[PDB]
Amino acid sequence: KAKLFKKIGIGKFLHSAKKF
């Protein structure tokens, strides 16, 4: 799952932010 790009703990923010 988390074994492709190099950002998993720094992309969840900008993601959750635009999520709600």
XYZ file of C-alpha atoms in Angstrom:
20
model
C 0.000 0.000 0.000
C 2.389 2.749 1.167
C 5.324 1.510 -0.948
C 5.312 3.611 -4.142
C 5.869 7.367 -3.891
C 7.873 8.964 -1.050
C 5.229 10.969 0.840
C 2.598 9.379 3.119
C 2.680 11.436 6.342
C 2.987 14.796 4.553
C 0.320 14.350 1.867
C -2.514 13.345 4.212
C -2.787 16.943 5.465
C -3.312 18.723 2.150
C -5.539 15.740 1.323
C -7.727 15.847 4.437
C -7.815 19.646 4.203
C -9.411 19.591 0.728
C -11.376 16.502 1.794
C -13.750 18.312 4.171
